[PDB]
Subunit: 146 residues, 4 copies
């Protein structure tokens, strides 16, 4: 019955993406603030089931963008070799703060709730490309905060 | 208990209208953006239970309007002959996009939720002239999006 | 669980007030628009259980006000004589529209929802002076509309 | 399912804080309007389980601030002596109104709802540093009102 979330930022229990072993993997990250390439080196970190860094994708070419941005991953590691199938965490660091010496942060499975969908009887959140059940959401707050 | 949907755009499972066989049929269509007659030929298409085009109503005279607009249909086809009673789909195309070569779209049974009504204990959505049960709604989002 | 109504206009199934037979009766009416004394003769009509006009209270002295306004009724009719105890409907007409020749309207038991209260476990709506259970509400919409 | 309360001011059944008997006690108070040191003497009152004033913390140094402010209490009384462990109420008075001769008021366990969190399946309100279950909330309203 509640669609009050629409427009709020949502955080979910989905932090990872399944890689089938072969085919490339499209995914969406939400950037609360505008990407500034001059402030640090912004990038995406792709991590395996044991927190091992497997691929790093630089974000510098997306300077000046904000909000949902789509990306692909060929499924290869840093050397260029295909990785084992499985679940992989996808996080990002951007906009090094001059004062605090800290990067702003984001990851797969959080972002602005753009619409609410009822699939059969059940409710579902559209968060860019991702469409998740309501029960997966673990926190809500307004933009430009937290 | 939730009226959070007031002000949101709603999409419902109601896509059609029953024509009794004789009396004219009033109906409401919601226009998200302002009708521009210079951009394509805007019109309403009225379709029977087998997707056969039965009547076309030109929208050019409503240039410059937006939001809910009311319309009538005498129940006649393009030749001027009354059609069988039954259920008829009502869609519209407007504002041909110069770049994409695609029309914006709307139909009966979607639009801004203007109020929420409680019939007996049960809740209902006012969407222009139409008043539908909440359970009929299949998606919600904010205006000027999707 | 839902407080989304706060800030919306609410309409309830409470349309009347009990008069005990003797003591005066305080009550609250909500004025969607600013009272204009030059446009018609604005007033409150007090009606008994059989729709009989019992007292009329002129509103002209409240020109220029809007929103919740409090009033009292001594419990007397137009002649000055105390009326039978019981339930009495309280409506008002104000701001005669020059074009439509129609008065704007309001009554006891509708208005802006100013807060939501949880009394013991149960939820409750503050609507000026009146505090009603949520189940009494029969419609919701935003200000300056309907 | 409802997060409509995000952005609203909340009042809860939590009015006190447990002091363990030794370690200092961090806490948050919400200031609806900007602290004006020139208007009265603004301060926090800390009260024991029998409404006995135990410590007073002056607020004058926080002139010009508004919203959630964090504070600590060493757990000592006005003489400088550690107090018995237990539950202690924490209220504040600020901004003496020239006309009414009354202080504005606040206390621990009310304020703006900044986010909504789901612990396991269950919902929770972030109100500055405090995180409370939804069931603890006893009233909601919009800012700058009540």
């Amino acid at each position: 019955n509640s669609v009050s979330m629409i427009g709020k930022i949502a955080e979910t229990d989905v932090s990872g993406a399944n890689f089938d072993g072969n085919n490339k993997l499209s995914f969406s990250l939400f950037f609360d603030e505008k990407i500034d390439a001059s402030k640090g080196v912004p990038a995406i970190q792709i991590l395996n089931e044991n927190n091992e860094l497997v691929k790093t994708i630089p974000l510098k070419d997306y300077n000046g963008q904000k909000g949902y941005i789509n990306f692909e991953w060929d499924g290869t590691n840093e050397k260029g070799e295909k990785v084992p199938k499985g679940n992989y965490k996808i996080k990002a660091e951007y906009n090094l703060d001059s004062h605090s010496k800290q990067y702003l942060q984001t990851r797969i499975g959080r972002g602005e709730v753009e619409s609410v969908i009822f699939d059969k009887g059940k409710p579902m959140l559209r968060m860019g490309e991702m469409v998740l059940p309501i029960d997966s959401a673990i926190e809500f707050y307004q933009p430009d905060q937290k």
